[PDB]
Amino acid sequence: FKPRNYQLELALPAMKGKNTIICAPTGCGKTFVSLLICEHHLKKFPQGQKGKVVFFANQIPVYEQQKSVFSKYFERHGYRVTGISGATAENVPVEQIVENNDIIILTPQILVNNLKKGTIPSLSIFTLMIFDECHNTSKQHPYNMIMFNYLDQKLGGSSGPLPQVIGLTASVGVGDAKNTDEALDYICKLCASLDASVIATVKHNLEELEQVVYKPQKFFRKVESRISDKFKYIIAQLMRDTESLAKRICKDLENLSQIQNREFGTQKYEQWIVTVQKACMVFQMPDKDEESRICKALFLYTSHLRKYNDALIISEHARMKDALDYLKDFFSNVRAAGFDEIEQDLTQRFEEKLQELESVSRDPSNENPKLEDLCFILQEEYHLNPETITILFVKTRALVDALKNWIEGNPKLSFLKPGILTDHNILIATSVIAQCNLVILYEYVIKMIQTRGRGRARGSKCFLLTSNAGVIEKEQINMYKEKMMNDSILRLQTWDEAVFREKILHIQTHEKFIRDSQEKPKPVPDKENKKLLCRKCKALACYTADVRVIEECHYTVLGDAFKECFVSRPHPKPKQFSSFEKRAKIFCARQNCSHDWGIHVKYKTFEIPVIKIESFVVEDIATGVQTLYSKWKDFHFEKIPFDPAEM
RNA sequence: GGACGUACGUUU
RNA sequence: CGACGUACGUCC
Ligand SMILES: [Zn+2]
Secondary structure, three states, rough: OOOOOOHHHHHHHHOOOOOEEEEEEOOOHHHHHHHHHHHHHOOOOOOOOOOEEEEEEEOHHHHHHHHHHHHHHHOOOOOOOOOOOOOOOOOOOHHHHHHHHHOOOOOOOHHHHHHHHOOOOOOHHHOEEEEHHHOOOOOOOOOHHHHHHHHHOOOOOOOOOOOOOOOOEOOOOOOOOOOOOHHHHHHHHHHHHEEEOOOOOOOOOHHHHHHOOOOOOOOOOOOOOOOHHHOOOOOHHHHHHHHHHHHHOOOOOOOOOOOOOOOOOHHHHHHEEEEHHHHHHHOOOOOOOHHHHHHHHHHHHHHHHHHHHHHHHHHHHHHHHHHHHHHHHHHHHHHOOOHHHHHHHHHHHHHHHHHHHHHHHHHHHOOOOHHHHHHHHHHHHHOOOOOOOOOEEEOOOOHHHHOOOOHOOOOOOOOOOEOOOOOOOOOEEEEOOOOOOEEEEEOOOOOOOOOOOOOOOOEEEEEEEEOHHHHHHHHHHHHHHHHHHHHHHHHHHHHHOOHHHHHHHHHHHHHHHHHHHOOOOOOOOOOOOOOEEOOOOEEEEEEEEEEOOOOOOEEEEEEHHHHHHHEEEOOOOOEOOOOOOEEEEEOOOOOOOHHHHEEEEEOOOOOOEOOOOOOOOEOOOOOOEOOOOOOOOOOOOOOEOOOOOOO
C-alpha cells in the first residue's frame, strides 16, 4: 500500500508517457508497478476525458488474481473494473463492456478474436496496454498478433490516439543467440515488436532487489546409468520378435522410413515408429478387406512397438518396476477393448515373458543409480534440515507419477509426502512460489523460473540430476546467456533515446515487409468428392460433401448415415470453449477398432460430432491416391459453412 | 475440437 | 537456415 524507491524507479520512465519493457523479478513488485502506473495514468487526465487501460494476462489463475487485486484497489477512487474470460465472453456485448468500463483485464485471445470478427475496430479506443509476462511476444502469440494489429494501425498512416504499450516481465530472454551481437539484436527485435525505447531495470536501488531476488545455487550432479540391463535386453528381444513377426505382411518395412540406424528406447526410434505407422497407413490393396486387415494388424504392431519404446524410456529414467507396471496397465486397458488374433498373440507373448520380467524387476541389485543418488541427496538434505519443502521437476507425465509411486514405496525414506501438481513435503511437478527452498530437476531441461511470482531469499538450491554431461554444458551456456542478456540491457540503458527509437522503427518496417511477403493466397478448392477412412480400420466414414465448417476451425458431419458410424463415450474432463460444450467423445463403430475419431458437443441447440482430420486418411475417388494430412488447415477442399437451416 | 508457445529429437 | 515427430504447458 506504500510505494518505495524500488517500486517507483521502475515506473518513473513509464509515467513520462512512453512505452517501457519494465523487468521486475518480484511478483508483488510487478502488481504494485501495475497499480501505480494505472493510478498515475487514470489520474493525469483532465475533466471530460477518461482512460481505458487494458491489462493483458495470459493465464486464468494470474488473470483472476490481477482482477481481484484491481477490483480491491480501484474501489474508493470511483473506477469501474471488470473482466472478460473464456467462460464470460459467450453472447456478451464486449463492445459495450469496453465502452462502459476503463480497467478491463480481458485476455489477449479475446481481443484477437474481436479484432478478427470486427468488434473494437481500432485499438485507439484503449489508452494504456499493460502486458503480463511480455517476453512471450515472439511469434504468432496472441500478444504478437495484438502488436501486429497495433503496428499496422500505426504505420498505416492513420495513427490516432495510440495507447501505451508498457510491458512487464522478469527476464527479457535470449532465445537462440550465441554472441553479444545476436543477443542485443534479439532484445532490440523484441523491443521493436512491443514498440518501446526504454527498459526499466533497477540500477540505483539494487539493494532493495538483492534483499529478496530468489537467486539459488546450482549443484549439477552428472551421474551414470545402469550396466546390467536385463530388463532392457528382454524388452529389446520382445521388440525384435514383434518386428520380425510384423515384417511377414510388409516386406518393404525398412524402405518406408530412411533416416539412419535405430536402437530400441530412443526418441529417434519413436520418430521412426510414427513414420513407419503413417507410411503403412496409406496402403492401397484392391481387395478393400484384406487391405483393412493388414492396415489394422500393422497399426496394432506399431502401437505395441511404441508402447514398448515408452516402457524402455520409463525403465531408463524412473525405476524398473514402474516400466513393467506401465506395460501391465497398457495391456489391461487394451484387453478390455477387443480380442482378435493380433491381440491374442501379442498379449500371450507378453504374458509368457512377464514370468521372467517380474523376477528381473523384483531384484534389488538392478536399482537405478540415478534414483539411488536422488534418494541419497534427498535424505542428506532432510537430515541436515528437516523443514525443507522440495519441488522435483520431471519431463514426462508418466515419470512424474512413477517417481511418486517410488517415493510412496521407498523404504529408505518415510518423511516424504507426494504433492504431484501435473500434508505435502515433496511437490513432484512437471512444468510451472514464496516457498519450496529446494529444486531437483530430474532429467528436465529457463525451466526452473520461479522469479515471476512471490519469492524469498536466504536459502535455495537447484540440484540437477542427469545422465548426459551434454545437458550440463547446456545449462552452463544457459547461465552464460543470462549474464550476456544482463550486459545487453546495460548497453541499452547506456544508449540514447532518439536513435534507439529510429532503429526499432526500421526493425518494425522490415517486419511488416516480411509479413506482407508471407501472405499465402486462397487455396484452390478441389471440386471432387473425396471420402475419409479410419486410420486403423480403413472403413468408409464420410464424404467431403457431407462435411460442414462452423467457425473456419471446427469441422462436423451432417450425414444421418454417419450418426450410426460412431459410438459415444463419456468425456474424462468436460469443459466449455468459445461456444461449445464438450459432452462426450466419438470413437469408431467397428468390430475391434475403438479408434479415437473426435468429440460429440452441442453448438447452440444441435448435437454435433466434431471430427479431427488428424484421426483420418483422405482417399480420392477420381485419382485413387490416399493422402494423409495432420491439420484441417492443410486439407484443402470445399469448406462449406455450417447451415442451421438443414439440421 | 482449434490456435499458441516451450523442450527434445529427425531431416532437405 | 525451413519443414517434420514426440512430450509438456497455455489459451479460446
Ligand atoms: Zn475404424
